[model samples]
Target chain A: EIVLTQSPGTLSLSPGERATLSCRASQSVFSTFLAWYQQKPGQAPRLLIYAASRRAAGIPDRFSGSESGTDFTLTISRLEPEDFAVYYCQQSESSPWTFGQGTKVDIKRTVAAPSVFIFPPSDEQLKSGTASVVCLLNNFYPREAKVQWKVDNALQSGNSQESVTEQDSKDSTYSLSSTLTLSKADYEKHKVYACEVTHQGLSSPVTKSFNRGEC
Target chain B: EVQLVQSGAEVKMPGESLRISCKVSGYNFVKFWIAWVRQKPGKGLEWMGVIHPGDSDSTYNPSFQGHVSISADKSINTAYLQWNSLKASDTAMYFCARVVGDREGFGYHYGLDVWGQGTTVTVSSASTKGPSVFPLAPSSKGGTAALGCLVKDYFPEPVTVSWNSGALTSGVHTFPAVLQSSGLYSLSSVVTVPSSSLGTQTYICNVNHKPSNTKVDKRVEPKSC
Candidate 1:
């Protein structure tokens, strides 16, 4: 039986730099079950190394794995811009798979603006006398921003809710959402309902507008 | 071993304010994120937000967005959830959980595997507690005057002072409440109003002290100068 621990929990680097990510096992285990993966933001993590030091198919030569004593090392000889992703090691030798806490390879971003979108409820919701509108704020960095809702140009009161920031592992940026609930009559009566987002990345606030007919 | 110890139960009134803390131990405090989850009596869990103690990076649930604030202090290995004003609906039990990174399943799940015992909060309707009213001297500017509400002697260290100036807009204000040496508290809130509106409109200051029977609202009229 073995337990894995990842070090330097986060790896901050720039492209073209060489970095070594380490995963240590609590006890010695056969190399056959040791595997490594690269988890990109917003995408499924891809397996990079397996059987301890064997490279998985389609993995680039720049990524190589080696085992020393009870420890395993995954090295990126030269990090490309795409190599900026979280890395983790897993062991399947045990009945229940064990994994090391992923090591995040962060590529410092200059600035990235967010894309604002919406998800309105089904037609059945309108028939039921209630409506819910979800506004999504995605891909912004530094994680400080505000989302405001307006009905007929006045601030929406009391019924809007927001979510905590969620990280997009592909990039170190973040995403979040705000939902506004309205009575069917209020939703239909309002000519315009808007979501206004304010982030440091933008000089002025960005807004997305929705109307009752769209639902 | 990872452990999260939370504060005790709290009884509050609508419009009152309070802050509860969660202290972490037996682990590398700065390495992981600590998140807060809320459960209204008999209700399911609500994910409020999580803060990475190492960098102070945080994410919040929009539902609990503006109304509640969450922060962590790494030096002391503790996280806090603060409410500037409590509403009857805010009454609930809050628990702090340690986020375990497991990308294999959900590709980074909430994975709140280790949780602290829940801290309970109850909010009920109550009367105003403080805010002794005083009509301040007229301002130097014409048509504008200031009204001051002095609040003292409160408890549990949370209070709210709001201004109501009929239909007119109230000027910006501040409420500074200080804890006294004898375990009591004192504070003051000042709002500027139109000198002419004093008689025509009513201005009242509402102060709420939680868990106490007293709720105070002091009204002030413009002094004829």
Candidate 2:
């Protein structure tokens, strides 16, 4: 197995500054079989370079790759507004392919609070005598928004699953989804179950409740 | 040596039924779970489903549920992924992996640990051609050398590559197969080794064309182009 180390965890620059990211492998990447990727907060990652130096189809020439032994570099000549995202380097030269921790190319950007929604359990869950409520926190900035489930203002235990950091293609914001699963007695005992979201942009947390009685 | 042997390549038309098998060996088939993974051409791996061969109980990813079936036969020690109707979008490489539990570790850790050689499914190619292998001369310099094997012009996209009898695994990397405009594929695998080794020994590049059940071996000799 090969391990990859990336340098400069954060690269802050303006729109036109040249950015260079590094990826060094524990061993010589055979034939420099390295690749680079660009990922925004909420979308699928895009391939930028392959075979170490060749740009992927439709990728602009501004992004380039070069290597010397185990050290590989991905350089962007001039950053576009869309390029202010996370960059990762990967190696396919050996077993257990590896990736870099990612370098975030930061620039000044606006922040916004999340719009929260809590959808109650469906008929199927009711039929099974179980409850699985869903929470959607959309259009938020600073992707690391915190969330927890609550029952009548009492903080619940256990980490929630089904959290998806889904970003809408329509704009530059982050969206998150989390699901809460519980037993029939637990669901009916509580009058209300809520999704509590805390964002740095907000002075207070946003709460979206699903009333069991209403359902 | 928990091994998984998956079925071979498949090519079919739309609306056809298909079932691929993953036969298990050297491990308790009913104890561990078996997961089916899909890697569409040029895309990352996608989790399809996981099944317990003991009870044939399974859980499919929400994205893949209702689209495919996952089953197992305890008697045969095999797990399978079946499709009621196939589409062009189903063309991809499928892998079967064994899910194991690490009880002694902190808390409990479980994951897909052992994997099978993938099965290729290509929907409707007019014709298919097995890949050809060509040995590339080594770049010997400094303390290490890089040897390459070029495998090209294969159709329906699944090929196997090995270097030095599969003994040389440390510094090997194979690029993804590229689909050409001509409806064929090409890719290369390279291995790095001590430059001194190149002076005294020969290296072999073996490529398996699974569809035709044929293989090509090319050897590199000292100072031999």
Candidate 3:
């Protein structure tokens, strides 16, 4: 089984700009057996490229594919108006035939940056001597946002957090929540814990913090 | 006014020879390609192969190649899916569609704009019946269990037998389809899966005989007689 990770959840670019979408396979996708598709609302998806690099019938030369090991790239030399839609990459050479989550290419617009919120560990957790915090990142566009947990301004790793990316459903954006579950040993009654969020729509990564001082 | 009119449904017995047609019109036939996709009962589409009808250039899917042939007659604006010796598992609804593009490249193919009303092919034996599940015995250790699927009274030498989508490589034993005195076929397949997962996980014994258009799913569960 292979998991295809399409980056930049959403690509914000103008028509005529070069667009490069990526699909990274969890393992080496043999024979360069990859395909790219362009999908628009209420229409059947068009096959833009297949077998990793070959342009499908009737597809223009501007659409091309690139490969290096497990990383595959689909580049549009110049994005046309109709091409400004969601693009997906699929792996067909192996079982569990997989498709990328989708990289949407739409016109650049004034969009919403993620609004961060930090929920301090609950009283139940405090009573159990457990340390955990829930951080919410909402209204992020292109769904290209990430969250990492930190303690006392230092990065936390090795099962420090569990994350989820869910669409707003009512609209076309992302709402994410990450639980920073630190080992009880790392739970300092006075230490500051924060969630750092990064998105293409934002000028810089944003952070929200919580500590015992607030409680 | 693009159109794709296909041959009518067909009924054939096992080991028979068959050929189905897709008659196309209302466009420049030689400029585009025609492709074949088939679907089994309660299944998804499977691409059989495709042909660039003009020059008769064709390529097959490794899954269906050699078992069948894809050919066409550009002058007549028609294409075909042919089988030399059909099996029961060959029962399916096959369709032909227009491939949108002219330049020859082995990359992605596009738009199945004009598609034919599928041609249904039934390869069957009147006496074909579903499978009978045997007892499931839980293994002593690892909390694993062994189950059996006894498929009898079928008339095809080949049948697809799998456990849980055949995704679990938990070791399964499959026996060949044997010809019975009644002139039908029978097969036996047994699989072992972790017993602890029996309560939450679903293990199914899928017995498929395409010729008879028969599919039997036997679920492995805790049942009281």
Q: Per-residue CA lDDT of candidate 1, range B1-225, in tens?
A: 767888988878778889999999999888777878776643334558778886886677665779999898988999999999998778678878776554354334324546677787867654334433333222223354555554544555467666663343334243334433333444445554666766776777766765464567777554333
Give the range where candidate 2 chain A is weakest over 10 consecutive residues by summed lDDT: A162-171
* lDDT (10s digit) by residue, model 3, range A1-215: 67889887878786789999999999888534687877664333456887778887688999998898888899999988778777878665554356677887866545678666555554434554555465655556765577888788778776443333333333445555555555465576447878888887779988877555443
* CAPRI grade, predicted model 1: incorrect
Against the true two-chain complex, what DockQ does each candidate achieve? 0.02, 0.01, 0.02
Ranking by TM-score: 2, 3, 1
Task: List TM-score per model, in order.
Answer: 0.32, 0.42, 0.35
lDDT agreement with native, every candidate: 0.67, 0.70, 0.67
Winning candidate number (TM-score): 2
What is model 3's DockQ versus the real complex? 0.02
DockQ-wise, the better of 2 and 3 is 3
Better of 1 and 3 by TM-score: 3
- Model 2 chain B: weakest 10-residue lDDT segment is B102-111
Off by over 4 Å in 2: A5-20, A27-31, A37-59, A67-71, A79-88, A92-108, A122-125, A152-159, A163-166, A209-211, B1-225
Candidate 1 off by > 4 Å: A1-14, A19-32, A39-47, A54-59, A66-72, A81-86, A101-107, A112-128, A136-139, A142-177, A180-215, B1-225
